[PDB]
Amino acid sequence: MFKAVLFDLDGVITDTAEYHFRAWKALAEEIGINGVDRQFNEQLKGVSREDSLQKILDLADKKVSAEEFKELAKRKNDNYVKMIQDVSPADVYPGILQLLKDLRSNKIKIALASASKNGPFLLERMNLTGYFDAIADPAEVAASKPAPDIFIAAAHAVGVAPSESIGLEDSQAGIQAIKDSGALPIGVGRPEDLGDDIVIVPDTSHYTLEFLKEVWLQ
Ligand SMILES: O=P(O)(O)OC[C@H]1O[C@@H](O)[C@H](O)[C@@H](O)[C@@H]1O
Ligand SMILES: [Mg+2]
Ligand SMILES: [Mg+2]
């Protein structure tokens, strides 16, 4: 049986992937880049704040000063932080709270593997911090998603091998990070976006301990 579950946050625990998208789009448009639509944004999910800005700039072949780059990333984060102030426990995605209770029941470790620096604030907003055995700090890993390091670190933090862990993720970058860590990915979203080669569910109600069950056993 698997011994840990490694959770992405944005788009898995709650609908904050939508907020990051709206904030990145607004920022891109402020600098004249209009190509951040939902399809492009699939490239930004699970990517770090600086990496995301760089992808947006690269899409446009745009160069900015180092001072401007720093201000832009800060500008987007300040906007996103305002956007998330009223997130509450009512915003937890369906299935998630029960999954956390069911896992703790069954002595299965729970770790956060979010690229977001705002993750601990969000778990507090949703009254979920007490479910987590560890939160992997994304500032502490040398490489961000799609590198596997955050997932490896999360598994480590709870004393469980990545090979004995399931990783939940809504993004292309994150699914790749889970594959490369040795953990078993179960994505949430559209196969059109996330692939036909792993188990993908349409929404988080599917993330039951029974199903993780089911998938692990094969
Ligand atoms: O800017 P933050 O909060 O540190 O978030 C970094 C990243 O966190 C990830 O969880 C999101 O999928 C990305 O969209 C986001 O860019
Ligand atoms: Mg995500
Ligand atoms: Mg605690």
Q: Residue 6: enclosing H or E segment and its boundaries?
A: strand 4-7
User: Residue 193's closest CA among 7, 14, 17, 34?
Assistant: 17
Q: Indicate which atom in ligand 1 lies nearest the CA of residue 44.
A: 14
Known binding residues for Mg(2+):
8, 10, 170
E strands in 69-115: 109-112
| Measured distance CA(82)–CA(89) in Å, rounded | 17
CATH class of the 1-14+93-218 domain in this structure:
alpha beta
What resolution in angstrom units was achieved for this structure?
1.4
Nearest CA to ligand 1 atom 14: 45
How many of the other CB atoms lie within 10 Å of CB of 140? 10
- Distances in Å between the Cα of 151 and the Cα atoms of 45, 98, 128, 171 are 16, 22, 19, 14
| Gap between the Cα atoms of 21 and 76, Å rounded | 10
Of the candidates 101, 10, 84, which has an alpha carbon nearest to the alpha carbon of residue 47?
10
C-alpha distances out from residue 75 to 80, 82, 107, 128, 213, Å = 9, 11, 41, 27, 42
Q: Which atom of ligand 1 is nearest to the CA of 10?
A: 10
Closest-CA residue to 166 (of 11, 48, 12, 10): 12
Catalytic residues: 8, 10
Domain boundaries, the chain: 1-14+93-218, 15-92
Q: Which ligand sits nearest to residue 130's alpha carbon?
A: 3
207: helix, strand or coil: coil
Give 39 Cα–ligand 2 centroid separation in angstroms.
Answer: 15
CA distance 46 to 56: 14
Tell me the two tokens of residue 91: 């915003």
Cα separation, 159 vs 60, whole angstroms: 43
Which residues line ligand 1 at a C-beta cut-off of 6 Å? 9-10, 17, 20, 44-49, 52, 77, 114-118, 171
Domain 15-92 is found in CATH 1.10.150.240: yes
* Ligand 1 pocket, mutate which of 41, 43, 49, 141 (most atoms under 8 A from CB): 49
The rounded Å distance from CA 202 to ligand 3 centre is 30
